[PDB]
Amino acid sequence: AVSVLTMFRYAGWLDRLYMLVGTLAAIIHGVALPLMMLIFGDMTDSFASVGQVSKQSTQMSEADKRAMFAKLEEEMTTYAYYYTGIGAGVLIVAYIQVSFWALAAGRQIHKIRQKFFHAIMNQEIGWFDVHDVGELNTRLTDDVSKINEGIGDKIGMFFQAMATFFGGFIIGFTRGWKLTLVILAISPVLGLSAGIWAKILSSFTDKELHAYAKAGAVAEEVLAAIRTVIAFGGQKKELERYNNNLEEAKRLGIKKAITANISMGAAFLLIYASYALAFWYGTSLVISKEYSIGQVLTVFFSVCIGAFSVGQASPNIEAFANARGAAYEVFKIIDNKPSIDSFSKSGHKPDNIQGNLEFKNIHFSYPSRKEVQILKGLNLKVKSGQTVALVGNSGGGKSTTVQLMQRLYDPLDGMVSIDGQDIRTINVRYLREIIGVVSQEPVLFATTIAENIRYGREDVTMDEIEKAVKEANAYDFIMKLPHQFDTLVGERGAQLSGGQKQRIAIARALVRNPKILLLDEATSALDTESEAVVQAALDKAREGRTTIVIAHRLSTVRNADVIAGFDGGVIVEQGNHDELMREKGPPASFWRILKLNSTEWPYFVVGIFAAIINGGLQPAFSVIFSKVVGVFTNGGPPETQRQNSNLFSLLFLILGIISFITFFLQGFTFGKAGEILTKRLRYMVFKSMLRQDVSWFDDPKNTTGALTTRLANDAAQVKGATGSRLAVIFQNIANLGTGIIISLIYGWQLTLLLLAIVPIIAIAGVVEMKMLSGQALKDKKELEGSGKIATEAIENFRTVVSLTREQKFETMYAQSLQIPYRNAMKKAHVFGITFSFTQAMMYFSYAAAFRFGAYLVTQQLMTFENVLLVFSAIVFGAMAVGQVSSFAPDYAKATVSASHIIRIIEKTPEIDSYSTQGLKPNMLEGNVQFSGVVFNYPTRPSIPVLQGLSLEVKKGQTLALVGSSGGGKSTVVQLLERFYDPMAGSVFLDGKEIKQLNVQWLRAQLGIVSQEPILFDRSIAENIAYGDNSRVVSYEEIVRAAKEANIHQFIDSLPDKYNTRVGDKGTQLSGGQKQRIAIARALVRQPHILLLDEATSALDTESEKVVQEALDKAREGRTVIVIAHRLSTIQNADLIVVIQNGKVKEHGTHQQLLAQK
Ligand SMILES: C[C@@H]1NC(=O)c2csc(n2)[C@H](CSSc2ccc([N+](=O)[O-])cc2[N+](=O)[O-])NC(=O)c2csc(n2)[C@H](C)NC(=O)c2csc1n2
Ligand SMILES: CC(C)CCC[C@@H](C)[C@H]1CC[C@H]2[C@@H]3CC=C4C[C@@H](OC(=O)CCC(=O)O)CC[C@]4(C)[C@H]3CC[C@]12C
Ligand SMILES: CC(C)CCC[C@@H](C)[C@H]1CC[C@H]2[C@@H]3CC=C4C[C@@H](OC(=O)CCC(=O)O)CC[C@]4(C)[C@H]3CC[C@]12C
Ligand SMILES: CC(C)CCC[C@@H](C)[C@H]1CC[C@H]2[C@@H]3CC=C4C[C@@H](OC(=O)CCC(=O)O)CC[C@]4(C)[C@H]3CC[C@]12C
Ligand SMILES: CC(C)CCC[C@@H](C)[C@H]1CC[C@H]2[C@@H]3CC=C4C[C@@H](OC(=O)CCC(=O)O)CC[C@]4(C)[C@H]3CC[C@]12C
Ligand SMILES: CC(C)CCC[C@@H](C)[C@H]1CC[C@H]2[C@@H]3CC=C4C[C@@H](OC(=O)CCC(=O)O)CC[C@]4(C)[C@H]3CC[C@]12C
Ligand SMILES: *SC[C@@H]1NC(=O)c2csc(n2)[C@H](C)NC(=O)c2csc(n2)[C@H](C)NC(=O)c2csc1n2
């Protein structure tokens, strides 16, 4: 499924030179940094040699030194020259690498995309029938971008990474071969620890995801069943179920958070212990007078940077692997030789042809469905100038003879010859342009009528092509509205009708001046008004050349003189009609609202204290590191070096263990707070949504899938704005402020210099990221601009290949892609320049910092201990701040947008939902006066409905209404339980307005039955118990409801009824019994008034009688309102009054029998 080192197969000599120079620059830039460490080591050795000042006899003599301080000055001047030279070299080389690699990638991608479109627009139609279209286009858009990203940036930087790895290891083995081995021994431990912690975290995350998805099942269930849940008024039970299920997800997320934070703690402890071991074993050697402090530093740093690089070049291999995976398919689409080329110039040129088509034993079956044999041989011959008509159900599926005419497929064992010569030898393009074909649905292109006609053949003299357009149905529909020119017809803009689309397609076909014409479904589902003109145009085109017509309409059949119509694959004679039946027939959150939401003010003091401690440790690390270097640079008594070294190594170890315990505690408290916040947010969001109203649920913006994703994968992001985003800011301040205060105390000069320089590189990186993101957005904009013509061409491939215009779309694609070709190159150059400037600023800042430090030391202001402390507390503090900011769950987004969205959902208005504001009368007469009411759906108010209704209900009534279930035109049943709020018409129940009535009381008296009885995973007995939600639930009434609904005989099988859950579609229930238990659940509440509807029950044809008897018993027991399209049920209905828009108030028989069929 991959292909290695064939990608560059499309690379020219210039591209190969670009790649070679880029690789050389990557090698040089990778080797640069170990040389930086070597020069730093020599610098430290020189300072240690000069600043020893251990001789008290010469401490004052000769004005102290003032002679070899000049040597130090000269050595530091030449080292500053080394630093600035390597900086300039990197400044050139980084650009030479990135710009050249990205230019080569851009050229390769442009060639790949252009020739890939050329190849895909070359394959035969059968390939398109076998494969898909949407996935194919998304492949065109996505795989090319994957290849670009990979074989540009990532292969550009992988060579840098390996060059740094080799350079660092050569430096180490060259200078400190004793220390390098022990550093090599301790290095894999960090990687192994990281890997094992990552594996544990991944396992915990997967377990938590499954445990929560167990709850997500019921989350999705009672939101897809939201209508039934609201109607039955039992949201409390689902709230309880969701809380119980989330009780486990919270507990597993606790372990996940603990694992992640203790993983980071171990990652810090191992690093600190590595520093401890390295400097312990280096100090021992230095005291043994083997290695100098410079030789320890330049070897340790070189080895660690080498290991870091070889570990950091994982993504540049992952991206290359992904690019290879995409490139395999992209390349297999190319190089695929088609049976029909339509591009090769091979083929004889017959001129002055007649067109005596013929067919002899044409066997063909669609490769999409090879098992089904459509065509089983035909024998037929025609003469030029004689039209042939085919009549039947379809032309072999759908105009199979038409499809095979233009080489769109390949016949099996069949032979066809236009003039005695097989169509295999003739040129494909020549055959295509001598055959005219009109589609049943004439697709056009989002372009003017001028070019739409131009795509007929060669756009020639515009006056000549207009004269070609001068056929019938012109001069009226082409000038009045179309402004005589530049119509720009398309789905979007200047949209026309099929009556004119067919005519313009016919005009386009006549422009080509075909020799043989094919007609297929000229007026397939077209309006009869547009008829009798398109037929006239077709006839006047027919009088010229031979044509074959297949159409359902009999008018063209009559018009045609010769008719060989048949069906079933068996040929029938031409000319006569014998034995041919002819029946006529969102704003950003303020971030204090989130903290107020996280009301647990405990669990945060401990976290803040731990974060402050951990942030303050890194400056203490810099202090101890500076002291370690100072022990040898500004050395004193040789016998105290051992004690100082042991103390400082023990200090590293103590710092490591205290940092590890700091993350243990901080992670415990912050993860606990985050998980409890997530559980609270999920519970409250579910409560708010179940309180929410039917109108809000019906809003198509709140699609159930997106809503469930918001409940699941968005309510857990807020963990990243009150948690990590509170810990990281305090850690960063306790790091940087503590570093800068110590720097100000000791080396305020160098402190100000470095604190003025560091913001420059910081803002340079920030602006680099901004401009890169902006350029990527713009490039995606033009890429989608090209993708519109790409998809417009690919979607209508059948038509564009039926027409001979094939290279036109390739040329248009090239023209559309030309601009992104230059945009990519300009973006590549900009990225190269900014990368080179950021690296050059880093190295030049390093050089200037040590040059100023050397000046100050020569001036005898601060020692090298202080210089190194200030430097390593200002720069390495900022780098650690950047790393800690990077290691955060993204406060910018994923957290900021999700948090505000769910805050809006939580603070949503309550639209006539459950509340204490309600009247609950103790009597219920069961009378509703549904008259003088008008209502429109809030989701689609543009279509006014439900106008002029007068209804009256009494006790024992069996009111039967007729309303369209399509679009829910009969929404009276919906309005009864206040699914929607009436705007003008008032409804009075028992002489009381429902507005003052309690919503729960109203919904506790309405036995509604839906069309499709959606079912939960709950057992059958408790499903029946669902009727009496928020009421007394017990047993031996479910049995009574079952007896009433006549389900006892069916539930005799597995009579337990308690474990018979319909889970996994287990214990399956068919439609009839599911409806029967739906009415059972309606009845178990024992409501005074019932609503019913039966739509698909009539499909059962067996349970109809049982469900009708159950409904009969229910309605004789109590008043029932029925609305259904089934006239059979109402025929049965007895005490009824048909009403339609208030027009009828009695039996259909009583007035005109409009009600009866
Ligand atoms: C988890 C993650 N780590 C890194 O992103 C990272 C990459 S590099 C590195 N750290 C070097 C060692 S390099 S690890 C190592 C250590 C030893 C050896 N070896 O050859 O023995 C090799 C390697 N190696 O694989 O490169 N770190 C230092 O110099 C150093 C001194 S204080 C300090 N870090 C503080 C405690 N950490 C942070 O502020 C911080 C924030 S986020 C984070 N760390
Ligand atoms: C060692 C340092 C100090 C001197 C660096 C010299 C470079 C400026 C040279 C080295 C190899 C050269 C290149 C070698 C080959 C070409 C191919 C050539 O590609 C084209 O044909 C595009 C022409 C166009 O602009 O239309 C453009 C210049 C380039 C990259 C050369 C430009 C300049 C390069 C990078
Ligand atoms: C000033 C020189 C001696 C030292 C520094 C070298 C690089 C910083 C510059 C100088 C000349 C530049 C080249 C001059 C001209 C071109 C052609 C131009 O590309 C094109 O117009 C077409 C390239 C293609 O698509 O093949 C941009 C890249 C390139 C190679 C440039 C790449 C970057 C180069 C090598
Ligand atoms: C990261 C994993 C894979 C290995 C980490 C090893 C470190 C945790 C060990 C290795 C050597 C140890 C050091 C070896 C010797 C000493 C001296 C000793 O300290 C003293 O004060 C004793 C002085 C003396 O009696 O000589 C004990 C602690 C210390 C710093 C040890 C601290 C812990 C170190 C750095
Ligand atoms: C006399 C001494 C004590 C003066 C101390 C100066 C402090 C009051 C200033 C100097 C630099 C500031 C820091 C510069 C950088 C940042 C930005 C920010 O760090 C981030 O990475 C934020 C990331 C994000 O939330 O997007 C948090 C505050 C912090 C640490 C600042 C906290 C306040 C600091 C330490
Ligand atoms: C546009 C971006 C990449 C910033 C570019 C900055 C560099 C051009 C500057 C910043 C700091 C400068 C350095 C700061 C201090 C010194 C010491 C200074 O003194 C000498 O070396 C003495 C020279 C003499 O008199 O012979 C001049 C060179 C050097 C390395 C400077 C070289 C030029 C550097 C690298
Ligand atoms: S060790 C690999 C490489 N390290 C250096 O380049 C380097 C030279 S000096 C030095 N690090 C001092 C000892 N480092 C710090 O003070 C320090 C504090 S925080 C920090 N470094 C962050 C964690 N470092 C990195 O992310 C990092 C990437 S490569 C690298 N260090």
Numbering used by the authors: 32 to 616, 689 to 1260
Excerpt from the paper describing this PDB structure:
P-glycoprotein (Pgp, also known as MDR-1 and ABCB1) is a prominent member of the human ATP-binding cassette (ABC) efflux transporters that removes a large variety of chemically unrelated hydrophobic compounds from cells. For Pgp and ABC transporters in general, ATP binding, hydrolysis, and subsequent release of the cleaved products (inorganic phosphate and ADP) fuel large-scale conformational changes that ultimately result in translocation of substrates across the membrane bilayer. To address this fundamental question and overcome the dynamic and transient nature of substrate translocation, we tethered a substrate molecule covalently to specific residues along the putative translocation pathway of Pgp and utilized cryoEM to capture Pgp structures with bound substrate during various stages of transport. In conjunction with molecular dynamics simulations, our structures trace the substrate passage across the membrane and identify conformational changes in transmembrane helix 1 (TM1) as regulators of substrate transport.
Four single-Cys mutants of Pgp (Pgp335, Pgp978, Pgp971, and Pgp302) were generated for crosslinking, and mutations were chosen near the two previously reported QZ-Ala binding sites. Based on the appearance of the yellow DNPT byproduct, Pgp335 and Pgp978 reacted with AAC-DNPT within minutes, while Pgp971 and Pgp302 did not. Importantly, Pgp335 and Pgp978 retain notably higher ATPase activity after crosslinking than the respective apo-Pgp mutants in the absence of substrate, suggesting that tethered AAC still acts as a substrate and that Pgp335 and Pgp978 cycle between IF and OF conformations. In IF conformations, TM1 is a long, straight helix. The non-crosslinked molecule is bound in a position that resembles the one previously reported in a crystal structure. It interacts closely with the covalently linked substrate, which is situated further up the membrane. Both ligand molecules are oriented along the vertical axis of the protein and positioned side-by-side through hydrophobic interactions. The uncleaved DNPT group of the non-crosslinked substrate is evident in the cryoEM density map.
